[PDB]
Design an enzyme around this catalytic site. Structure first.
Site, PDB file in Angstrom:
ATOM      1  CG  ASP A   1      25.151  -8.129 -56.857  1.00 48.19           C
ATOM      2  OD1 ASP A   1      24.946  -7.330 -58.033  1.00 48.19           O
ATOM      3  OD2 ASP A   1      26.287  -8.397 -56.351  1.00 48.19           O
TER       4      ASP A   1
ATOM      5  CG  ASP B   1      28.845 -12.061 -53.770  1.00 44.70           C
ATOM      6  OD1 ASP B   1      28.293 -11.535 -54.792  1.00 44.70           O
ATOM      7  OD2 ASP B   1      30.278 -12.453 -53.882  1.00 44.70           O
TER       8      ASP B   1
ATOM      9  CG  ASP C   1      35.367  -5.749 -58.555  1.00 45.00           C
ATOM     10  OD1 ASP C   1      34.637  -4.746 -58.228  1.00 45.00           O
ATOM     11  OD2 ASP C   1      35.904  -5.260 -59.617  1.00 45.00           O
TER      12      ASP C   1
HETATM   13  C1  LIG Z   1      29.527 -24.572 -64.662  1.00 46.72           C
HETATM   14  O1  LIG Z   1      28.462 -23.909 -64.125  1.00 46.72           O
HETATM   15  C2  LIG Z   1      28.252 -22.768 -64.977  1.00 46.72           C
HETATM   16  O2  LIG Z   1      29.195 -21.739 -64.776  1.00 46.72           O
HETATM   17  C3  LIG Z   1      28.776 -20.478 -65.845  1.00 46.72           C
HETATM   18  C4  LIG Z   1      30.111 -19.634 -65.721  1.00 46.72           C
HETATM   19  O3  LIG Z   1      30.021 -19.306 -64.272  1.00 46.72           O
HETATM   20  C5  LIG Z   1      27.656 -19.913 -65.655  1.00 46.72           C
HETATM   21  O4  LIG Z   1      27.416 -18.859 -66.216  1.00 46.72           O
HETATM   22  C6  LIG Z   1      27.253 -17.554 -65.908  1.00 46.72           C
HETATM   23  O5  LIG Z   1      25.906 -17.575 -65.381  1.00 46.72           O
HETATM   24  C7  LIG Z   1      25.536 -16.199 -64.938  1.00 46.72           C
HETATM   25  C8  LIG Z   1      24.144 -16.051 -64.339  1.00 46.72           C
HETATM   26  O6  LIG Z   1      24.435 -16.796 -62.721  1.00 46.72           O
HETATM   27  C9  LIG Z   1      25.711 -15.170 -66.092  1.00 46.72           C
HETATM   28  S1  LIG Z   1      25.292 -13.475 -65.570  1.00 46.72           S
HETATM   29  C10 LIG Z   1      26.471 -13.099 -64.506  1.00 46.72           C
HETATM   30  O7  LIG Z   1      26.001 -13.654 -63.322  1.00 46.72           O
HETATM   31  C11 LIG Z   1      26.996 -13.288 -62.300  1.00 46.72           C
HETATM   32  C12 LIG Z   1      26.366 -14.079 -61.146  1.00 46.72           C
HETATM   33  O8  LIG Z   1      26.700 -15.567 -61.227  1.00 46.72           O
HETATM   34  C13 LIG Z   1      27.116 -11.770 -62.007  1.00 46.72           C
HETATM   35  O9  LIG Z   1      28.300 -11.809 -61.375  1.00 46.72           O
HETATM   36  C14 LIG Z   1      28.144 -10.924 -60.279  1.00 46.72           C
HETATM   37  O10 LIG Z   1      28.452  -9.572 -60.473  1.00 46.72           O
HETATM   38  C15 LIG Z   1      28.162  -8.427 -59.850  1.00 46.72           C
HETATM   39  C16 LIG Z   1      28.363  -7.128 -60.536  1.00 46.72           C
HETATM   40  O11 LIG Z   1      27.280  -6.999 -61.483  1.00 46.72           O
HETATM   41  C17 LIG Z   1      29.102  -8.613 -58.600  1.00 46.72           C
HETATM   42  O12 LIG Z   1      28.726  -7.500 -57.688  1.00 46.72           O
HETATM   43  C18 LIG Z   1      28.900 -10.064 -57.860  1.00 46.72           C
HETATM   44  O13 LIG Z   1      29.690  -9.965 -56.710  1.00 46.72           O
HETATM   45  C19 LIG Z   1      28.931 -10.914 -59.008  1.00 46.72           C
HETATM   46  O14 LIG Z   1      28.837 -12.443 -58.541  1.00 46.72           O
HETATM   47  C20 LIG Z   1      27.476 -11.221 -63.224  1.00 46.72           C
HETATM   48  O15 LIG Z   1      27.466  -9.775 -63.144  1.00 46.72           O
HETATM   49  C21 LIG Z   1      26.416 -11.549 -64.361  1.00 46.72           C
HETATM   50  O16 LIG Z   1      26.772 -10.956 -65.639  1.00 46.72           O
HETATM   51  C22 LIG Z   1      26.764 -15.485 -66.973  1.00 46.72           C
HETATM   52  O17 LIG Z   1      26.917 -14.502 -68.054  1.00 46.72           O
HETATM   53  C23 LIG Z   1      27.377 -16.739 -67.312  1.00 46.72           C
HETATM   54  O18 LIG Z   1      28.377 -16.950 -67.749  1.00 46.72           O
HETATM   55  C24 LIG Z   1      26.511 -20.938 -65.653  1.00 46.72           C
HETATM   56  O19 LIG Z   1      25.123 -20.269 -65.036  1.00 46.72           O
HETATM   57  C25 LIG Z   1      26.900 -22.222 -64.769  1.00 46.72           C
HETATM   58  O20 LIG Z   1      25.778 -23.084 -65.225  1.00 46.72           O
END
Ligand SMILES: CO[C@@H]1O[C@H](CO)[C@@H](O[C@@H]2O[C@H](CO)[C@@H](S[C@@H]3O[C@H](CO)[C@@H](O[C@@H]4O[C@H](CO)[C@@H](O)[C@H](O)[C@H]4O)[C@H](O)[C@H]3O)[C@H](O)[C@H]2O)[C@H](O)[C@H]1O
Length: 293
Positions: A119, A81, A266
């Protein structure tokens, strides 16, 4: 043929959900519904290499005694994670490899469905390039070792349709030898609709020489919460999705499974909510209520 067809998925008689359903006074329809639905059994660094073989042999043997297919989720990768709400995993790659050897020793030749590291491939970009290659090597090690059980149906986790692109994830799956496994898993612990995940799965299947996949439908009956940071972290208004089945709507979708266990938190989620993995009866009840149960 589909390795998952032909017997029911195993219902864990000692799940937190079952304990809650049995304790409920008066009996609660929502908890009973969740408790009697087959899920997956998650293993991590709480089960050390020295003993996890026995734990796995016990679980797979119990499932066999019930005429059922056990589903195990391996969640022990180092830097699990990326140090967030579900931080954990083994300390080093050496430790993780020993753990995988032990899990395989406990599988023997017994039937099992194995979900490898939710993940890990999708989140790998949080790591340095050398840590990332190490992680890919560890996932490949799991595939190569676990598939020595001919009766293990192995699915490498591949994130979801709003995480990496199909092309990006297929590249990673190809690198860890998805071809040796049955395929990959989608939507684990998330909320995206089954239809959206089938489209994504079929795309990845095309880019991995026809690999098959499973979708986590534990919490996707109402689709995802509105696009916002932490929308995957204990969102409200979500519903249980389709119960586990091999009657799917995707050409290469072997099953809908409940991989995540409904009711488990979660994480703290920036709100002081229960630690990741702790069962919360109210969470299970709300997911069931929102599904109209
Ligand atoms: C300021 O820095 C920026 O922050 C933003 C917001 O946090 C970042 O944008 C986010 O980037 C993500 C890519 O890393 C995506 S996809 C999103 O990713 C997260 C992990 O970072 C996932 O979360 C995980 O979900 C799992 C279940 O599916 C869990 O089991 C686990 O514990 C979680 O951590 C999530 O599922 C994905 O959808 C975002 O869309 C985006 O907002 C940005 O990159 C930074 O630069």
């Amino acid at each position: 043929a589909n390795p998952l067809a032909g017997k029911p998925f195993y219902v864990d008689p000692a799940s937190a959900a079952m304990v809650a359903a049995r304790n409920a006074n008066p009996p609660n329809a929502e908890l009973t519904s969740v408790a009697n639905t087959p899920q997956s059994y998650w293993l991590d660094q709480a089960f050390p290499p020295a003993t996890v073989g026995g734990t796995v042999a016990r679980y797979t043997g119990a499932a066999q005694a019930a005429g059922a297919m056990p589903v195990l989720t391996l969640y022990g990768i180092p830097h699990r994670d990326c140090g967030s709400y579900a931080s954990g995993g083994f300390a080093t790659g050496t430790d993780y490899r020993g753990w995988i050897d032990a899990v395989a020793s406990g599988l023997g030749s017994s039937p099992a469905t194995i979900i490898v590291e939710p993940d890990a491939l999708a989140m790998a970009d949080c790591l340095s390039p050398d840590q990332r290659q190490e992680r890919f090597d560890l996932v490949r090690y799991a595939v190569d070792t676990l598939t020595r059980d001919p009766a293990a149906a192995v699915y490498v986790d591949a994130g979801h349709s709003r995480w990496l692109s199909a092309e990006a994830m297929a590249a990673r799956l190809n690198d860890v030898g998805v071809g040796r496994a049955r395929g990959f898993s989608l939507n684990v612990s998330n909320f995206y609709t089954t239809d959206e995940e089938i489209g994504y799965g079929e795309a990845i299947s095309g880019l991995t020489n026809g690999s098959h996949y499973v979708i986590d439908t534990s919490r996707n009956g109402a689709g995802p919460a509105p696009d916002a940071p932490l929308n995957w972290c204990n969102p409200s208004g979500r519903a249980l999705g389709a119960p586990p089945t091999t009657a799917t709507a995707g050409a290469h979708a072997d099953a809908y499974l409940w991989i995540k266990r409904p009711g488990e938190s979660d994480g703290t989620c920036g709100r002081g909510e229960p630690q990741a993995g702790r069962f919360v009866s109210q969470y299970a009840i709300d997911l069931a209520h929102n599904a109209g149960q």
